């Protein structure tokens, strides 16, 4: 097998201004290699093949060299529409082998996310079980540490997050924390923290309540 | 024009088999080379196969001698993939794509066009409704401004549950998370901000349906006394 790497994994950037990833083979390719773009709810796209050629019906700002070992892609203008992940495939022998991606994301402001923590539900205590949940919302870059304190304990078990991608409205990132417990092991214990440490601010954002309150 | 249209989702268990399929239509069926591509959560696509529709022919990967057998029906223009002794690691999205050239002896080329992808669940467990449970404010807590009203929706399985907010009506503002695995069952949240004269003084509403379960639920979010 061939070994496709593509460097950045990460990339972000504005309308207008011009991008160019990496593609690099663990052997020669001789000039053999593609690009496709993948977007949500729509088919895997053809952009470029051969190293440099541009497919049919493909705008003329996606453009692509190399040769042997190392290739690249670079789009021209960015245009809102070229926000996507990019995959590189080689086709210069059996077995047809491609790189891992490149998500290519939209930059904007900074922006603190908006901290909210909630309680056990009482339906979910009456049967048993205790999920503390903790929203963190509207926030750029996507890069962020979140904390579970119990009664200022930092607590790793039970805790499962979920991102969204970048939004469609004003490109920001949102995450939900949720620490899991007996309901058992819940009672025992009486201030709950959830804390969000982001670019955005040196001093984390603390948000916690008391079980009695 | 030329489409790929690929099956609907399977759920197997362990050990089982699967067999999906990829309709061609608008161009000449026997002519190109197509070929299976296999796509598991952040790990890149994998090439499985491709067989030759005009002569019956196929390649695999080394990597899934054993897992797939590659097949076409020519009078349908269909393809048709079938994996065997099925895994967690079998787990994926799968795709058929159409060579972009016609021919047999440019197996390894590129592809022009992509079907939809068929997705694959491998798992053991059972189909439970889920459990949803209102998210409201610390007691007391309309802080400044706005307000953050969640919705959770706990252990069900397969995918998917679809959430609204009040019938749909309410729409911005809304963060619905993708859901995660917990052992065997999947589990999502959603949020709604919005402004704290809205509530508690108008009634906001959940909206949970479970398709596998035939589930319809609706959560008011009630202030936390």
């Known amino acids: 097998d061939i070994q496709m790497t593509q460097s950045p994994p990460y990339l972000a950037a504005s309308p207008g201004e011009t991008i160019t990833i990496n593609c690099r083979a663990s052997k020669s390719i001789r000039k053999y290699l593609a690009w496709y773009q993948e977007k949500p709810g729509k088919t895997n796209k053809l952009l470029i093949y051969?190293?440099?050629t541009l497919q049919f019906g493909i705008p003329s700002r996606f453009s692509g060299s190399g040769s042997g070992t190392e290739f690249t892609l670079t789009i021209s203008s960015l245009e809102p529409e070229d926000f996507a992940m990019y995959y590189c495939?080689?086709?210069?022998?059996?077995?047809?082998?491609f790189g891992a991606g490149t998500k290519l994301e939209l930059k904007r402001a900074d922006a603190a996310p908006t901290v909210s923590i909630f309680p056990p539900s009482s339906e979910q205590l009456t049967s048993g079980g205790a999920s503390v949940v903790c929203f963190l919302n509207n926030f750029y870059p996507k890069d962020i540490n979140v904390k579970w304190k119990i009664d200022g304990s930092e607590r790793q078990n039970g805790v499962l997050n979920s991102w969204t991608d970048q939004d469609s409205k004003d490109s920001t990132y949102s995450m939900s924390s949720t620490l899991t417990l007996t309901k058992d092991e819940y009672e025992r214990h009486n201030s709950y923290t959830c804390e969000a440490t982001h670019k955005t601010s040196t001093s984390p954002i603390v948000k916690s309540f008391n079980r009695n309150e | 024009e030329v489409q790929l249209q690929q099956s609907g989702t399977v759920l197997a268990r362990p050990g089982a088999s699967v067999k999906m399929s990829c309709k061609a239509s608008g161009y000449s069926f026997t002519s190109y080379w197509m070929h299976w591509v296999k796509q598991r959560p952040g790990q890149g696509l994998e090439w499985i196969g491709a067989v030759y529709p005009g002569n019956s022919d196929t390649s695999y990967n080394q990597k899934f001698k054993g897992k797939a057998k590659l097949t076409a029906v020519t009078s349908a223009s269909t393809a048709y993939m079938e994996l065997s002794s099925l895994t967690n690691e079998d787990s994926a999205v799968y795709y058929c794509?159409?060579?972009?050239?016609?021919?047999?002896?440019?197996?390894?080329?590129?592809?022009?066009?992509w079907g939809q992808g068929t997705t694959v669940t491998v798992s053991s467990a059972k189909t439970t409704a889920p459990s949803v449970y209102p998210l409201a404010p610390v007691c007391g807590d309309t802080t400044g401004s706005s307000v953050t009203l969640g919705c959770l929706v706990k252990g069900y399985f397969p995918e998917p549950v679809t959430l609204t907010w009040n019938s749909g009506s309410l729409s911005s503002g809304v963060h619905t998370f993708p859901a995660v695995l917990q052992s065997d069952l999947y589990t999502l949240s959603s949020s709604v901000t919005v402004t704290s004269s809205t509530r508690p003084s108008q009634s906001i509403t959940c909206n949970v349906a479970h398709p596998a379960s035939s589930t319809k639920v609706d959560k008011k979010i009630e202030p936390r006394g």
């Open positions: 051969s190293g440099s």
């Open positions: 495939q080689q086709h210069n022998e059996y077995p047809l082998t």
């Open positions: 794509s159409r060579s972009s050239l016609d021919g047999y002896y440019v197996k390894n080329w590129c592809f022009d066009v």
